Amino acid sequence: MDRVPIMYPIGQMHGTYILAQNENGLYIIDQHAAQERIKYEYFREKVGEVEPEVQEMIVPLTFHYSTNEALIIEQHKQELESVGVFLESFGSNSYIVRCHPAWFPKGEEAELIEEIIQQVLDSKNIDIKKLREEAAIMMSCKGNRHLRNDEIKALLDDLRSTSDPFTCPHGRPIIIHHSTYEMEKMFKRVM
Amino acid sequence: RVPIMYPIGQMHGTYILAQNENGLYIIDQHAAQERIKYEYFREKVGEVEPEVQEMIVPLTFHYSTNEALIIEQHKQELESVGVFLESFGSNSYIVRCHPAWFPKGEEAELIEEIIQQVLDSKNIDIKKLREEAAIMMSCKGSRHLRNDEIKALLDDLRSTSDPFTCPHGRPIIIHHSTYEMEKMFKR
What we know:
Two copies of one chain form a homodimer.
Chain A: E1 8-13, E2 17-22, E3 25-30, H1 31-48, E4 54-64, H2 69-75, H3 77-82, E5 88-89, E6 94-101, H4 109-123, H5 128-141, H6 149-161, E7 175-179, H7 180-187
Antiparallel strand pairs in A: 1-2, 2-3, 3-7, 4-6, 5-6
Helix pairs in contact in A: 1-5, 1-6, 4-5
């Protein structure tokens, strides 16, 4: 797939669409879809990394489980480990977490860790590929402003760098393009 | 009947981008400017006695016998659009004046063009010739637009009888409505 060429901001509208252009023509961009594409690939890359920078917690977290649940979790300890969940056995069906990747959404670590662990519970069986995918989604969730052109330019540069600037992880188009040729044809003035 | 359009910007020195509650507007500057000029000239050609201006450089025209017949048949029609032909013998005329509001410096070409429309139609009435002439006038005349220029254009275009379509029937505006944009991005 050809990489989209550098795009330059024209402006925005309604805190919803970005208007940009280059020599090729006009780009109309759903700014929310763009942000989702950018965020997903960021976290998906992160969770794939082999040795993240870890952050010890001021206060260690605790989690307690049934004999059924703790057992599911036990087989999948490798998987959870790779997604940034560092469980430490303290007793029967119980776990402690003292640290996490530094790139976890700040201040929502505990919620995230529980949700990841919950995912493994609900499926009973699951592999790294699907878990890493689910985890990056949950991370992208963590939390209509009208963007200035400097913020727009930053977003466009970031979008260009992703593996798919045209369609978001959930199937939404991100970009609608009218080439200069297409624009001339639509106005029928010079063609 | 578009509401106020607020500028987003311009591109390629050719297109203006604008928005309001109804969505996105992409405007061809050149076509917009002709629609704006047309609204003006259509009014002007409708005046029974407009301000007239003597020419510094009078024009001469020669026609075939049959063309001159057609020209004489349409004396009233031609005068109604500001073409004041004066007979001087066989198949020949001079023009010594014209409305002050004829596009400056392009009077000679315009007059010749208007007469040729009459010759080609063979028979044409005042209403249709006024329309054709105003279209011709609106296409006469000669960097990126400044912000005041963009606002003036948007307000002026909006103040015409058809902001969407040019005197020649081509689009002035490509409009992606809120509804259409939501569909495009499958929201």
